[PDB]
Design a protein around this ligand. Sequence first.
Ligand SMILES: [Cl-]
Ligand SMILES: [Cl-]
Ligand code: NI
Ligand code: NI
Length: 162
Amino acid sequence: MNIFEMLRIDEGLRLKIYKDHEGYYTIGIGHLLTKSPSLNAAKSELDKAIGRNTNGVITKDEAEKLFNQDVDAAVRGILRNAKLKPVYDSLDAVRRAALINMVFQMGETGVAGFTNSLRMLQQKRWDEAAVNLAKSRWYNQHPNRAKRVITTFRTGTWDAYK
Ligand SMILES: [Cl-]
Ligand SMILES: [Cl-]
Ligand code: NI
Ligand code: NI
C-alpha cells in the first residue's frame, strides 16, 4: 500500500464536477475547485487547471494528473513548514503517509495548527495523539476517514485500509 492508493481510497474518484460534503465544488480525486457557490466559477477553475474547455467533465487520466500534482504539493507543503517537517522527519514510512493524507485534505496550514497532536506524534506517544486528534472538527465532520488515519498513526500499519 502507499500514499496514492491510500488517498485514492479516502477521496474516491468523480469525473464530473460535484458538491462535496461541505457544499464545495470538487472533482477528480478530492480536488477542491472552489469554495464559491458559482458553478461557473468552478467551471472556470477547472478549465484553467486542465487547460481545455471541459464543460465540468474530465477524463480519468486528467483526474490522475491533478492527483499527482496535488500529492506533490502536500509534500512540498510539509517540507517548507517549520512545524511539519521535523515531525514528518521523525516518523516511519507508514505514518508519514498518514501525515501526507492530512496535509492533502486540509492544507499545510490547517495541519500546522494541531500543535499538541504534532508534539505527541513527534514524541511517539501514539495513543495520546490519537485521542487528541479525535477532538476536532475534522474528526466529527469525517468520522470514518478520520478513524482510518488516526488508526494508521496509532499502529504504524495499513490495517485500516484492508
Ligand atoms: Cl491546479
Ligand atoms: Cl468520513
Ligand atoms: Ni500494496
Ligand atoms: Ni471535508
